[PDB]
Amino acid sequence: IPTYDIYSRLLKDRIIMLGSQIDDNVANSIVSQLLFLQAQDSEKDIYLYINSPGGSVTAGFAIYDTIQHIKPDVQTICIGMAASMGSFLLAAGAKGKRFALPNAEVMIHQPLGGAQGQATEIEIAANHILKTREKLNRILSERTGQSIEKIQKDTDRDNFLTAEEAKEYGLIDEVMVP
Amino acid sequence: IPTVIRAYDIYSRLLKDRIIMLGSQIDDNVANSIVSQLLFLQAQDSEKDIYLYINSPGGSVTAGFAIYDTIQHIKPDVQTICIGMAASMGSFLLAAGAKGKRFALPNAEVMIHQPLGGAQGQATEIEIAANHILKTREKLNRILSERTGQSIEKIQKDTDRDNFLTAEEAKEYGLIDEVMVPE
Amino acid sequence: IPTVIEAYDIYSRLLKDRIIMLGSQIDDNVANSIVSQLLFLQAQDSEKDIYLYINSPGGSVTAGFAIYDTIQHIKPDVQTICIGMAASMGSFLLAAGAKGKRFALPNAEVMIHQPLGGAQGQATEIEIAANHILKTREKLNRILSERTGQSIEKIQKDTDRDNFLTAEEAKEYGLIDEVMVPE
Amino acid sequence: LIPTVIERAYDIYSRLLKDRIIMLGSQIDDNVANSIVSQLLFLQAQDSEKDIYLYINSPGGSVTAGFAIYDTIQHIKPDVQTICIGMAASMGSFLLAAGAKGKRFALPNAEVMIHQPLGGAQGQATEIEIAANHILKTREKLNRILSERTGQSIEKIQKDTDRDNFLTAEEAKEYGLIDEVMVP
Amino acid sequence: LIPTVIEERAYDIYSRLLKDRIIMLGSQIDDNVANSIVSQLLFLQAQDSEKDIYLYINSPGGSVTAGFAIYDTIQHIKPDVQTICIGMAASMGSFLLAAGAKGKRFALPNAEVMIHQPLGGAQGQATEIEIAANHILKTREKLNRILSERTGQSIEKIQKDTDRDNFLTAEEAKEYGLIDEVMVPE
Amino acid sequence: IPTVYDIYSRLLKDRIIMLGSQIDDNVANSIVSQLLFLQAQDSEKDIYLYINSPGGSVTAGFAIYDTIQHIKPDVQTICIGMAASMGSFLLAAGAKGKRFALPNAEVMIHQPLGGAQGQATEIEIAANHILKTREKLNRILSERTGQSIEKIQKDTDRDNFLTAEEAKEYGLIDEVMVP
Amino acid sequence: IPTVYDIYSRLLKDRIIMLGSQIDDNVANSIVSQLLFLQAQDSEKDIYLYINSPGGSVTAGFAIYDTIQHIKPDVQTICIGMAASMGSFLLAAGAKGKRFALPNAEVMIHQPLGGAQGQATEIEIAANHILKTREKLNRILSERTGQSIEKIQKDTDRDNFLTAEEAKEYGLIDEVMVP
Amino acid sequence: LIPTVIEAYDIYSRLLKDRIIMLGSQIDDNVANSIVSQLLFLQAQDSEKDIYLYINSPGGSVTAGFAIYDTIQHIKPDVQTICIGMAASMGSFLLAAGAKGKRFALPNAEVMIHQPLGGAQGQATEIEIAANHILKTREKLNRILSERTGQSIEKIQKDTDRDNFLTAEEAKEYGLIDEVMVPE
Amino acid sequence: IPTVIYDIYSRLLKDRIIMLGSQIDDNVANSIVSQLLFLQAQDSEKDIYLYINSPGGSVTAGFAIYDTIQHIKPDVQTICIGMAASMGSFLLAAGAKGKRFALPNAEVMIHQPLGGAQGQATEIEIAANHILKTREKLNRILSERTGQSIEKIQKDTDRDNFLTAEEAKEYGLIDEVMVP
């Protein structure tokens, strides 16, 4: 990573890079960067670059809730791929300031998890992941304008969208053309 | 495994006298063998009792149901005798013996609990797995209610966690009919 | 982890503004760091609030109690804010924040359950281990009863298995004081 | 590895079983218990009156597997003599003490060891409590039977099994775990 | 990461605590940990031979000889070493808790203190096993003698009470004489 | 293993038992069974125990030892290749006057090996047990060889390799079987 | 392994023993049992020991060596493929005038291999033992070949590969069996 | 993990400024290279002032230990040795190598002496070379320990045949140290 | 590794001391070559001190060090502390004539080179020829540096040969034992 390291130099210009799988460590870093940028200037836009295969739903919600909490608009820009919780965060950007570059890929699908143990433990785990899916679908319905029923059907299996299809779907506002 | 002299391994010699030994974890291989032995003994004599010895920590519920349904299907009464331990699907099979012919030896342990499983993948796959294991538990509890005389509500409460019973407690519960006391 | 130049890593820059990030499993290393940060912040300013951000699946009960006791020891109020998830010892620390200054963001998850452990060895060693984890559970439940206003009997029932709460449910329960709603 | 004797062809252990000798010569697990239980039931069916000889050279093993053997011994009509050769430890020493009264033996250099049961528990506090209560009840059951078989008090057996307790054959006789040392 | 504080000098958080005469024993005790703690004690004595030192203990214990390197350094130096148990002090960790300056051994209210006999092992010839057994029994006698001196309990009572794992609350550790005070929050 | 009976079963028909491996419970159970079987076939005729063994379990070895002393037939012992540790103990356990080695056979004597792990009091129990086991081995070897317990203790402190002729001088065997 | 008897059992009926593997205690126990069985069947008729072996355990090899010298029948040795290390020692141990190799068989001689770990005094005991073992091997090989102990010591310092004709010249065999 | 002191030194570098060298690990070539470098540096800074070598070590490499030993004897400053925790094997050899009258142990420190350990694999003549080398190494160690302690080589040979654990007071009686540093 | 106000090894290098205290591999040789070239550039006349505590290692890495020592203008003193074995003892013998030392309890070991080869007969032949030529090269240079004949070096290195510091001096591998 060249030398500020290159990411620290971008952060000085209010650019945050989400460029990996989303886990608690990545979420903690991005939340810290968002809070720091709000403290530096509560009015100026923040730019969140997304190239992510997704990851932890709770880690993703740490990022999502921090975006909605802070005063500055957070622009989202998909470069490469936004999949799963990565496409959820792309859709979470400020209304009118969600972008993808023309060859970027967006993928939506239902959450993944696991359950092991007694029948009643499996029931608790199943109910939890089903409630988590309902929560994701409700918010994605609000952010995209698509019905909960449509989001449920469209996320049953891996669903790959082009940048233009993601715009038609309401996950982004514009394809950033060169 | 010793041989007895025709030349039989000890288990084959017991099978000649209509004794079946369920002495391991229950998996498809064990169930296939026990089902085959039950069908063979019914063919050899459709009226004479069969004796099923149970020392098992349990295992596969579907493998256990292969044994359970074969017991109920065949004409001979199948006596069940718990020696050592009958746990989980093992205690279910103990309770499945012919009414009045379910036994435990005095220091045998019986344990009842809810079924165990696991699921990994998409939310909808986890939901299918959960619904399946919950329906399997309802099926087990309904049959155990019928075989013990306890309510489904009581069986559900009593199997929430591992529940260890003495032979005498298993008799009081209705899982067996008698403790076989030594002369 | 980026650097900010005024050179701080981003977490050190937050600590300058009295924000401590509990963003991983709780083990002795994490507890030693957070205890040291709390003692340092008290020394820097005994009056100004501290902000403990919690995104944690929990972890060691003794490590969690190192953090808990240090929070209660120091003079400044420690606000707690759940973002993402607070589970097990993480939800215990969330409930341990200054009265009126325990928060969750709207989509944060809170989970409560009984302590986990293990024991291997002689019967008497297993008895010692069991007695210790049962006493630990009684201590946790008594403190959660004090911090939530729920009865010990209700906390015992509600932590028997994994119990997932929304931010609004955690507020109704008394684990937090407010859901921090966005403008 | 195991030799054959021809009189019909028997492996050496099958030849001993023809003379009502059963070899408990390994760790006790469910497979070993199933075999020994089967041998005991077979020998009772062959002759309900004649003694059976159970040779014990075992480090012990599963308590429930051991109780499968113990209860089958007590159930059947023939007396089961027990003979410790080499070592009888843990559930092996329990089975040694379970032989017909007056017919429990050890050879002079055989080792007998008694100790409390071993196990494990993992999971939630309530699951650990269930496991602890179960192993403590199992220990009480073992100690009660050993008290009956030896003539020692339950309290003495509890103290004497707190840690590994090694006995010579003569000490095992003094304790009441065997009736006689078989001198050459 | 371990955070940095700037006061201008830049310190990792543990180095900042050391500047205020606080030493963190926050891991299993091995020779590396003991070398670090002994070095810190010698450094703090050289900086000020009169001012108290604060030894924080959150440790499951570890090496008895490494623990005795710390113990003897505490007794050797002129400053009082306060001990404070936070989280847990088990095995040689609880021994070091009891080793603090008389009247300045503390625990926070929910800290766990565990005492038990030393653990070890030996494999090889009968005479090698005999040497190993004699060594660990002599080590236990030495630990028990010092704990008797530090607590006021008899050696016979310490032997009985350490036969198996013995978990004490902070208040029980005070009653036992392993600490002087529970630091109750204001 | 060739057939004639497998070769070992054919030797057992002629009252020859082969102890040709490490001594563990399985080997001891087999040899004890063979000794009891041979006594039942003929209580008067000698048995021949061939020993080529590096030793092994002391309790397994004592299962064999006590069965030899219990039965009525004399058990001749013949060391071929090596008798080490509990193997040399069993060589010395043969009928007096009928313990042999072939000329190039190796005999090794040493103290018992073991291990101990856990609490100080558990290590003390393990140490006391292995020391008592060594006292028992040395007492019996003193009786079988005519050497003092003090001499056996000194001579087994470390691995002590003996030729067949040295084993005869020591009293572990009666004769070297010369061609 | 085909049946005719398995093929090896059929050869044993004609007094042929196959040493066709590494020499360990199991192989030695089997070969010793076969030698004793053949002596019992007929004390006068020759035995034929086929050797294709990379060698192995010296003590296991001495179990075979001493049994060969003990029994009454002559044991012919025939090297086919390879006789190395303790395998070449057993080839040289056959009845005088009845040690053979086939023309392309390889014979290798070298000093014994081993190991020692532990205290200096334990390493000293292990070193003394393997040096005494080498002296014993070299003394017997000197007797069986007619070469001096000094020459055998020099010639076994490193791996020394011999053709069948060189093994004859050396005195390890009596004849190359020409087709 | 290792704290910093700012006047910026890690804690060990700060002690080295006051002529203290901390040996708290197994002795290997890396540890020996560092301690040799520290001794040479301290001699260059001041050839007259004492150096203080703290030892808490289970020992390790004999040749690495001799790198330290010979450097101690070579340099002009006296090297005081102080055993804290344990000095075993080559660690106890280095403790005994300190300046005469300036070898110390704290009261609960342990000293252990024993013969050197090693291994050999291969041909008989390779095993002979390895055996002769470790026996000569033991003779070298025992001769120097005889000179440093005042005990005979015969006594050191007997006393190191197996692991021999000494208290601080016993190490003083033996001549491995000069004084037990008792607390004020 | 402590700091002085430099890490301890960097502080020694300031006084023209190079520490060869590990197995010799390409990384170690690259560092020591770089240090020798740097010290020559700082002062072409002042001695350099090479401390050797090494079990040896790569022959080609050892020759990188050997040739750099002979190339540069400053005398390179060699001092054996602890042990110099195999390529380590070769480098000890490579120091400036009259400036090769060992401390009294240092161990010196000489032996033939080690290697291996797997594959076709002709590949094994190439590997064997290469290691035999490497041995001839080492023995020729050791003959030049010690004054012993190639025949004596060949015999004396057939197996591991351990020398005391005094024996290493008698052999010609060092000039003096540095007595305290």
Ligand SMILES: O=C1[C@H](Cc2ccc(O)cc2)N2C(=O)CCN(C(=O)NCc3ccccc3)[C@H]2CN1Cc1cccc2ccccc12
């Ligand atoms: O709840 C607080 C309030 C929020 C706030 C911020 C600014 C205001 O004007 C009013 C309320 N809070 C503070 O009251 C002070 C400390 N803090 C800051 O945000 N401080 C500014 C800061 C400067 C440099 C780096 C990071 C933050 C914050 C810290 N926190 C907790 C907190 C901690 C960590 C992450 C958070 C993400 C979203 C919301 C709250 C977070």
Ligand SMILES: O=C1[C@H](Cc2ccc(O)cc2)N2C(=O)CCN(C(=O)NCc3ccccc3)[C@H]2CN1Cc1cccc2ccccc12
């Ligand atoms: O459905 C049949 C019928 C059942 C039957 C049995 C007895 C009767 O009187 C009438 C119907 N069936 C056959 O009709 C003929 C073959 N068969 C037997 O049970 N045959 C006798 C037999 C002899 C020896 C060994 C085992 C079985 C059986 C085989 N099967 C299929 C079958 C196959 C395998 C296991 C089964 C377990 C329970 C029920 C049927 C099983």
Ligand SMILES: O=C1[C@H](Cc2ccc(O)cc2)N2C(=O)CCN(C(=O)NCc3ccccc3)[C@H]2CN1Cc1cccc2ccccc12
């Ligand atoms: O018990 C003491 C007292 C507590 C104290 C603090 C402030 C007071 O006004 C009165 C008592 N103690 C001291 O008496 C002095 C050293 N110390 C400090 O807290 N020093 C201030 C400091 C400066 C820079 C970083 C961290 C702490 C503390 C250090 N400690 C031990 C201690 C050590 C480590 C963690 C602790 C957590 C909670 C309570 C005590 C801890």
Ligand SMILES: O=C1[C@H](Cc2ccc(O)cc2)N2C(=O)CCN(C(=O)NCc3ccccc3)[C@H]2CN1Cc1cccc2ccccc12
């Ligand atoms: O409960 C019975 C009765 C017991 C019995 C035995 C003899 C009697 O005179 C009366 C009752 N039972 C039977 O009624 C008949 C089949 N059986 C036998 O023991 N059969 C004789 C047999 C012949 C050949 C080998 C083994 C046993 C037995 C089989 N069983 C179940 C049984 C099955 C397996 C192990 C057992 C161990 C202890 C007690 C019962 C066991």
Ligand SMILES: O=C1[C@H](Cc2ccc(O)cc2)N2C(=O)CCN(C(=O)NCc3ccccc3)[C@H]2CN1Cc1cccc2ccccc12
């Ligand atoms: O104690 C008995 C007595 C001993 C006995 C033998 C012969 C006598 O004339 C008197 C006592 N015992 C029996 O009383 C009868 C069963 N048994 C035999 O040895 N039976 C003869 C036999 C025939 C075929 C194979 C093996 C043994 C034996 C079996 N046992 C137990 C026993 C079991 C297994 C191994 C033993 C080794 C030594 C001593 C006793 C052993």
Ligand SMILES: O=C1[C@H](Cc2ccc(O)cc2)N2C(=O)CCN(C(=O)NCc3ccccc3)[C@H]2CN1Cc1cccc2ccccc12
């Ligand atoms: O010492 C004996 C004597 C030797 C003997 C053989 C023949 C004689 O005419 C005289 C002495 N011995 C016996 O006295 C009788 C049992 N035995 C035999 O060799 N029996 C004949 C036999 C028949 C079938 C298979 C194998 C051997 C042998 C068994 N042995 C012990 C023995 C056991 C095993 C291997 C041996 C190898 C070499 C020498 C003795 C061995």
Ligand SMILES: O=C1[C@H](Cc2ccc(O)cc2)N2C(=O)CCN(C(=O)NCc3ccccc3)[C@H]2CN1Cc1cccc2ccccc12
């Ligand atoms: O042989 C010399 C001489 C020894 C010497 C030292 C002081 C004197 O007054 C006379 C001779 N030698 C030098 O002649 C100069 C370089 N050197 C030094 O010791 N230099 C001082 C120094 C300054 C800063 C860090 C370390 C050393 C040393 C370096 N060396 C080689 C050497 C190198 C490495 C470790 C050694 C350990 C013991 C003895 C010699 C060692």
Ligand SMILES: O=C1[C@H](Cc2ccc(O)cc2)N2C(=O)CCN(C(=O)NCc3ccccc3)[C@H]2CN1Cc1cccc2ccccc12
């Ligand atoms: O061949 C040269 C010449 C050699 C030279 C040195 C001094 C002279 O007066 C003349 C020729 N050479 C240069 O011509 C210039 C670059 N160089 C240096 O040695 N530069 C000095 C230097 C300064 C700081 C660090 C290291 C070296 C060197 C670099 N090199 C190539 C080189 C590169 C790397 C290692 C070498 C080891 C031995 C010989 C040459 C090596």
